[PDB]
């Protein structure tokens, strides 16, 4: 046992020089520059719709690109597509496995996906010559539970799993095109870049990694969190992303500077973040918490600018429409709310 | 009201039909008993499943007994972190735990110092004193008891328990094991533990499970009135 020690020491010096370069390139702090700009006012958003029909805890939701339809997944073994304007139910898809943890809606609107403790990602075709929704494909590569999935197009989907790996799938052939194997813990969330050439994943090893879709390699690694990372989302520009973890803090990272920029924490907030999202302009950072309510943060000044209260249990998911018109939140109390 | 077009009214009617179907499915799901099965891989989960019913992921087993529908969920195939998905089973009627009595002298393959019985005790302590199962009863099964009788003579029980001071009598050793396991729980008021000794019993295991489930259901029913 000699060469392994030498390689570990070499890795230690490599991390040391990476840290030194990051310190050298940290000339100022985003809080130092931003202090001169005018702050946003108090955010007073009120509930506009309430969607009922789920009879168990809601775990995931996803907006459609048209900003009107959305899909929600719940432990009662059902997948419901909602019309948010009229609160009408469009479809109800009964799942083979009721232990669902994630769901995604295709950008074209033709397909929906879900997965969970069955280690299988299912694809449903919403537009058939018949009047029903039927399973189109099943992906059975992962050896752990699926935590997240996002459509690249009608034929490509990327999934994260509890087997510490992420994979890119070809739906037509049902095969693993590419595998990503950099993490050392359970991968909990992933986010797709607006141009759909890179994606970031957060794992239980308190680290985030930037992956190249085509080359199948890890481009950058980000640290700073102290507990498992539960949520992740790119800044609308695409040059930054935000992470929420169990240590009751949110952080912003820059891809070009390869380091943290701001920290969003309050001394009286001690519960972990379950979900996080940005507004259309990127000025507002919305985060769901375990203390039954969501907090609206000023993404540039790290000051709380509003609170969304009205859920009786843990807020498990939230998302913003593509036009920035509304915000939807799902909770363990089996209810979905639309905010404006 | 009258401000909706024809297609809007038809869509509303479709939504109402979907709601009715959802309510019917919810009632049907609510009429059934959910159980979580835990334990070591060789602790005897497979033989318990076979007795009740007379690749990777989650394995569901469905059986009926005296007009009650049961479905057991086996989570032995998930090697990932338990705390990230154990909250999904909050709200099960009861937890079934399986421990092999003949494990007191065997040791784990990974660590020879770490014997199987102490690992089972650690898992039981972690599961029982969990923030999500603070009000869930536990059905405990001790399986390899004929092998326990055979091995209690050649290998004394003091190997696993240094502070053991009793005789090598079989029922005394079984009582010591049951008392040691039943003392891990720290609630003692919200949680009750049902312990049973089974080796190859026929329909006795199912009857015991049914009685324990009925006892849990009675105390859950007494919560709705409020006199409990």
């Amino acid at each position, epitope marked *: 046992q000699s060469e392994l020690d030498q390689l570990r020491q070499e890795a230690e010096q490599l991390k040391n020089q990476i840290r030194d370069a990051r310190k050298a390139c940290a000339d100022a702090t985003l809080s130092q520059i931003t202090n001169n700009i005018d702050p946003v006012g108090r955010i007073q958003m009120r509930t506009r719709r309430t969607l009922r029909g789920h009879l168990a805890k809601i775990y995931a939701m996803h907006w459609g690109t048209d900003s009107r339809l959305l899909v929600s997944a719940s432990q009662d073994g059902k997948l419901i597509i909602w019309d948010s304007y009229t609160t009408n139910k469009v479809h109800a898809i009964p799942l083979r496995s009721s232990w669902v943890m994630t769901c995604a809606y295709a950008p074209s609107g033709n397909y929906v996906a879900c997965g969970g403790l069955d280690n299988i990602c299912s694809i449903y075709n919403l537009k058939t010559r018949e009047g*029903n929704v039927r399973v189109s494909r099943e992906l059975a590569g992962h050896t752990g539970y699926l935590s997240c999935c996002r459509f690249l197009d009608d034929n490509q989907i990327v999934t994260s799993s509890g087997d510490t790996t992420c994979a890119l799938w070809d739906i037509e052939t049902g095969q693993q095109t590419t595998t990503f194997t950099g993490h050392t813990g359970d991968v909990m969330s992933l986010s797709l870049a607006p141009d759909t050439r890179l994606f970031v994943s957060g794992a239980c090893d308190a680290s985030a990694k930037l992956w190249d879709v085509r080359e199948g390699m890890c481009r950058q690694t980000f640290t700073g969190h102290e507990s498992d990372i539960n949520a992740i989302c790119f800044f609308p520009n695409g040059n930054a992303f935000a992470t929420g973890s169990d240590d009751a803090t949110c952080r912003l990272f820059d891809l070009r500077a390869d380091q943290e920029l701001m920290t969003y924490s309050h001394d009286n907030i001690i519960c972990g973040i379950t979900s996080v999202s940005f507004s259309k302009s990127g000025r507002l950072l919305l985060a769901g918490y375990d203390d039954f309510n969501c907090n609206v943060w000023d993404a540039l000044k790290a000051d709380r600018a509003g609170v969304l209260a009205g859920h009786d249990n843990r807020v498990s998911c939230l998302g913003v429409t593509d036009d920035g018109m509304a915000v939807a939140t799902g909770s363990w109390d089996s209810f979905l709310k639309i905010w404006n | 009201g009258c401000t909706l*077009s024809a297609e809007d009214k038809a869509a509303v009617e479709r939504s109402k039909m979907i709601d009715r179907n959802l309510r019917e499915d919810g009632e049907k799901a609510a009429r059934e008993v959910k159980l979580l099965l835990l334990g070591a891989g060789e602790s005897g989960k497979n033989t318990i499943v076979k007795q009740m019913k007379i690749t990777t992921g989650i394995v569901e087993t469905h059986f009926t007994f005296k007009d009650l529908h049961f479905k057991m969920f086996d989570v032995g195939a998930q090697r990932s972190e338990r705390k990230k998905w154990i909250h999904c089973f909050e709200g099960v009627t009861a937890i079934i735990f399986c421990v092999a009595l003949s494990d007191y002298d065997l040791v784990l393959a990974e660590d020879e110092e770490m014997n199987r019985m102490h690992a089972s005790m650690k898992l039981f302590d972690s599961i029982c004193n969990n923030k999500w199962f603070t009000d869930t009863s536990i059905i405990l099964f001790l399986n390899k008891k004929d092998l326990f009788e055979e091995k209690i003579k050649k290998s004394p029980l003091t190997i696993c328990y240094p502070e053991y001071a009793g005789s090598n009598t079989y029922e005394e050793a079984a009582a010591y094991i049951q008392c040691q396991f039943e003392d891990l729980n720290k609630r003692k008021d919200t949680k009750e533990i049902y312990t049973h000794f089974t080796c190859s019993t026929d329909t006795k295991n199912v009857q015991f499970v049914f009685d324990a489930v009925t006892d849990v259901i009675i105390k859950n029913n007494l919560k709705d009135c409020g006199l409990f």
Partner: single-chain antibody
Amino acid sequence: MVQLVESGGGLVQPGGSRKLSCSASGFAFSSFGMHWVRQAPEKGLEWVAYISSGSGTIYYADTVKGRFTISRDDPKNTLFLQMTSLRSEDTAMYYCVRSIYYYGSSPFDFWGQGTTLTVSSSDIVMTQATSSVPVTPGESVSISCRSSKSLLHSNGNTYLYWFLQRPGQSPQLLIYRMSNLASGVPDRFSGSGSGTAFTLTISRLEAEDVGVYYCMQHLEYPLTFGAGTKLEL
């Protein structure tokens, strides 16, 4: 494949009764509403009756109210139309149409192959002034339809439908809600309009586009068809 097959009809004496039935296969029958549409030997389409999914809602045309009754048997995938006190003006081709209603759906998408019935011995008005437009292949032709009442609704939807009936064939849906192409319709077709005046534009005209074009309104329950516009080569 999706298939709708109607049976019954024939020759009926005046004042008699007869039941027509339609058998469906290849799709989820119980999730669709169903319509009966009529076709006089030389005139255009005429809506008769409709039944919703779950049989909760039933509507009839004014001329057949009381005389006709419509029912569906979901387990057998069969739709029924019982007629009583038949008149000499009830002779027509009776079509059966399926329609599903939700956000973004396409009603009136599939039509059956009707059966001939022969007997011995307010509402929105849809107008198609032009009755014949002689055409040549490769030419761009426009077909116009106008409505007495505005079809635009407060929700931003314009409930206008375009249909095409080839010689010796059941009508086919082309445009729904004034702008949306049907799944099988080629991209050469285009639809536009504003409230009252509507038009259908065919570009790069082929030899398979010869037939009669109909406009329909879906705003009010008494659905009405405009008199067809025939295209001749």
